[PDB]
């Protein structure tokens, strides 16, 4: 497709159960961050 397999439309793609509960982690780290 057009881009990466581990990143979907809205951010990092959430595989483990930590990401479904804590989905800040999907899109945020640090100040330097882009989509």
């Amino acid at each position: 497709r057009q881009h990466d397999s581990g990143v979907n439309q809205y951010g990092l793609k959430p595989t483990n159960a930590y990401d479904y509960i804590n989905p800040t982690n999907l899109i945020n780290f640090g100040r330097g961050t882009t989509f």
Partner: peptide, 24 residues
């Protein structure tokens, strides 16, 4: 002790050793 949580603190991290202690 004080029998209740004074702090409402929920860490969201689930380290695998804390959970399956049979295998690690």
């Amino acid at each position: 002790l004080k029998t209740l949580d004074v702090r409402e603190y929920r860490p969201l991290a689930m380290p695998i050793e804390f959970r399956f202690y049979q295998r690690y």
